[PDB]
């Protein structure tokens, strides 16, 4: 009527107490001539379920009717126009509705054609599982890979995913029994971890860049392990790793040599 587009579609308004009592919603749909039904008929492409019921459980069992959160229909009414089906009000899809959402959206709320913003990005990601289960180290590889191919490595805030950089928190290296306490060396290692660096406090072949500890006389052992381990480790003072995330500026990897 008022919104005659809301007519012509059967509406199982049996639980319309989504936000307001069901009779309010029934009156609203009538004002738009919507085809309200107490029980879902065949063309009930919207089963108004503002509250779970045993009958709602049955309609869930009956994979023929579209059990919905009526908040979407509230949005449609506020727009005075049918909002397209969005895969978050939907309780029990029809198989047609399942493939419908799988078509006009991906496996999440995001579509395949309609562009989304950071708000919709956060909404989808919350809809997506907690994807922190993936090793942040493998995520580092992903980042490194993506940050290079997408040129997202331009962000200095996470740059050492590319870098296999060592850091010295020990007075002498290749001796795990030694450690500097009450120092910034551990803080610098945390800076490395902020960029997703391969944070290592012992020199091996995998080491590529070496951040010196507070004592800069260790560069002798640094070069000794640069020659025992075939990689020429890039000698780095504190300022390198500090400005990597404090100043957010990568320092020269050769200016600190010895």
């Amino acid at each position: 009527k008022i919104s005659n587009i809301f007519e012509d579609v059967e509406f199982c308004v049996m639980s319309g107490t989504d936000s307001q009592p069901k009779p309010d919603l029934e009156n609203r749909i009538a004002e738009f001539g919507g085809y309200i039904v107490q029980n879902p008929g065949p063309d009930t492409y919207c089963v108004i379920a503002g509250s779970e019921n045993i009958r709602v459980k049955n309609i869930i069992l009956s994979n023929k009717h579209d059990v919905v959160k009526p908040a979407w229909l509230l949005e449609c009414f506020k727009t005075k126009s049918f909002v397209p089906w969005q895969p978050r009000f939907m309780i029990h899809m029809c198989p047609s509705t399942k493939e419908h959402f799988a078509r006009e959206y991906d496996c999440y709320g995001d579509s395949y054609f309609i562009d989304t913003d950071l708000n919709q990005l956060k909404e989808v990601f919350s809809g997506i599982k907690n994807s922190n289960e993936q090793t942040p180290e493998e995520m580092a590889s992903l980042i490194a890979d993506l940050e290079y191919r997408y040129s997202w490595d331009c962000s200095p805030l996470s740059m050492f995913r590319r870098h296999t950089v060592y850091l010295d928190s020990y007075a002498v290296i290749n001796d795990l029994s030694t450690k500097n306490e009450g120092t910034r060396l551990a803080i610098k290692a945390l800076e490395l971890r902020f960029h997703g660096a391969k944070v290592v406090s012992c020199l091996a072949e995998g080491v590529s860049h070496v951040i010196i500890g507070e004592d800069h006389s260790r560069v002798a052992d640094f070069k000794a392990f640069r020659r025992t381990f075939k990689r020429k480790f890039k000698i780095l003072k504190e300022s390198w790793v500090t400005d990597s995330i404090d100043k957010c500026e990568l320092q020269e990897e050769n200016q600190y040599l010895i």
Binding site: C107, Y108, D110, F125, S131, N132, L190
Partner: protein, 48 residues
Amino acid sequence: QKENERLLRDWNDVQGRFEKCVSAKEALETDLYKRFILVLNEKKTKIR
């Protein structure tokens, strides 16, 4: 006691704060990158 202990405790507190911010950034980065990768793989399967 006064100066040395206040500075040691402030240093430890802010060091732990830096640890927490690094770890939280890494974890939220894991969520963001992996969820975006899931969506991007959906898009790439659709594109293919």
